[PDB]
Design brief:
There is one protein chain. The chain is mainly β and about 60 residues long. Helices cover about 10% and strands about 50% of the residues. It is built from one helix and five strands. The longest helix has 8 residues. It binds a DNA duplex (8 and 8 nucleotides) through strand 3, strand 4 and strand 5. This is DNA-binding protein 7d.
Length: about 60
DNA sequence: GTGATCGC
DNA sequence: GTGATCGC
């Protein structure tokens, strides 16, 4: 519902957090995948520092 | 290296 | 099997 903005292979992306498929923590990094067009899966990551709460709670609720 | 994945 | 990616 809210969005996450992140920079991936140069330049900024903004994705609806409803598209996020999987999220995991790597120390202070919040890493994820997300659904795109064409049946493809995108990757992105953000600092925990100001990560959207919607995304952080997904982390705490899944199941890897 | 780290966690996980894409895209070879 | 693995190189690049992401924040650190």
């Amino acid at each position: 519902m809210a969005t996450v903005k992140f920079k991936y292979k140069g330049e900024e992306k903004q994705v609806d957090i409803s598209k996020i498929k999987k999220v995991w923590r790597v120390g202070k990094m919040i890493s994820f995948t997300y659904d795109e067009g064409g049946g493809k899966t995108g990757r992105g990551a953000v600092s925990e520092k100001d990560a959207p709460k919607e995304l952080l709670q997904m982390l705490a609720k899944q199941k890897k």
